[PDB]
Amino acid sequence: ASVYAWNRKRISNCVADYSVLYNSASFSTFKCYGVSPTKLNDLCFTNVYA
Amino acid sequence: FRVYSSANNCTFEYVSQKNLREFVFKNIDG
Numbered sequence: 001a002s003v004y005a006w007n008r009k010r011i012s013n014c015v016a017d018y019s020v021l022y023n024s025a026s027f028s029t030f031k032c033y034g035v036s037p038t039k040l041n042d043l044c045f046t047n048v049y050a
Numbered sequence: 051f052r053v054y055s056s057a058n059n060c061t062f063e064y065v066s067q068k069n070l071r072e073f074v075f076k077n078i079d080g
């Protein structure tokens with residue numbers, strides 16, 4: 001969707017797999033602020049907004 | 051049904067696809 005109507009998806013009750021996220025090299029920028037990309041799989045969160 | 055007028059701000063939406071029915075509901079540690 002266009003930037004002004006940016007889509008917001010709530011994510012919860014799932015077992016995430018960020019390994020697929022940072023292994024793929026198609027993503028030119030994978031900047032993570034406040035969290036370590038390597039250490040993400042160790043942490044638990046209440047919910048995610050995409 | 052007519053249970054509610056409006057529903058919004060959903061957090062957790064789970065769905066499942068001569069007698070005595072007993073339940074015990076306990077809310078502890080969230």
Ligand SMILES: *[C@@H]1O[C@H](CO)[C@@H](O)[C@H](O)[C@H]1NC(C)=O
Nearest residue numbers: 008055056057058059060061
């Ligand atoms: C939650 O409150 C209203 C009523 O559900 C909802 O329409 C609104 O989008 C939400 N606002 C906030 C600040 O969470």
